[PDB]
Design a protein around this ligand. Structure first.
Ligand SMILES: [Zn+2]
Ligand SMILES: [Zn+2]
Ligand SMILES: [Zn+2]
Ligand SMILES: [Zn+2]
Ligand SMILES: [Zn+2]
Ligand SMILES: [Zn+2]
Ligand SMILES: [Zn+2]
Ligand SMILES: [Zn+2]
Ligand SMILES: [Zn+2]
Ligand SMILES: [Zn+2]
Ligand SMILES: [Zn+2]
Ligand SMILES: [Zn+2]
Lengths: 48, 48, 48, 48, 48, 48
């Protein structure tokens, strides 16, 4: 079987993997930010 | 109503918006990369 | 290279773009609705 | 417990459910469109 | 047209459908869990 | 600050984390399945 299409599949899979890794990072930051805001609200609930 | 929780909502919404903007960017790149690989396969279909 | 597969790629990309545009719209409405409910809860926190 | 926050939760959950239903619809159409393009490519593979 | 690629498309579509069904299940559980935590917070708001 | 809401946040975050872990698993399997079908198509391209 062809090394050539095998190589483009290597590229394709790597691209997908990076998209996976990227999407995980963004969602992580989203939750990190909204979690910080929530934890802040908590301190201003037990005080005001 | 309180400026304070209003401000944390400002932060929360901004965080969500950035997560939206971020997720759009990643998905765009994913498709850009897999599209390039596909278009390359096309040239190596009409030739080999 | 073939206009034909080039055209089907035109269709494919347009379909993907619409799916992108569509998914953005739904998520926007989701957040719009849940944001309204949250802002309502806020008024019934500073009052009751 | 309060009927009021219970009601806003009713609204919130309904909004989420609609977002779910909506996202499912968009993704379905995405795949329907890209599937049609693929099946078309198949006929123009076994012929040209 | 070929039964063979027709069959692999059968497999592909079934795989996608399972991924759809799976993603729906996970998101459902996510919301079920976070909804339970929210409803619990409600009881400890009207009491403490 | 209250151990109680701190604990429910522990639960909430754990639930979200599981949803993350779950969604990653489903998407992984989706791609594993569609990748296998693609690699099979490749062998039936270089032969038939
Ligand atoms: Zn992570
Ligand atoms: Zn909290
Ligand atoms: Zn874009
Ligand atoms: Zn093409
Ligand atoms: Zn938007
Ligand atoms: Zn608020
Ligand atoms: Zn469906
Ligand atoms: Zn096919
Ligand atoms: Zn469901
Ligand atoms: Zn509630
Ligand atoms: Zn993984
Ligand atoms: Zn291949």
């Amino acid at each position: 079987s062809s090394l050539l299409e095998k190589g483009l599949d290597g590229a394709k899979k790597a691209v997908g993997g990076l998209g996976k890794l990227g999407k995980d990072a963004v969602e992580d930051l989203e939750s990190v930010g909204k979690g910080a805001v929530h934890d802040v609200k908590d301190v201003l609930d037990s005080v005001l």
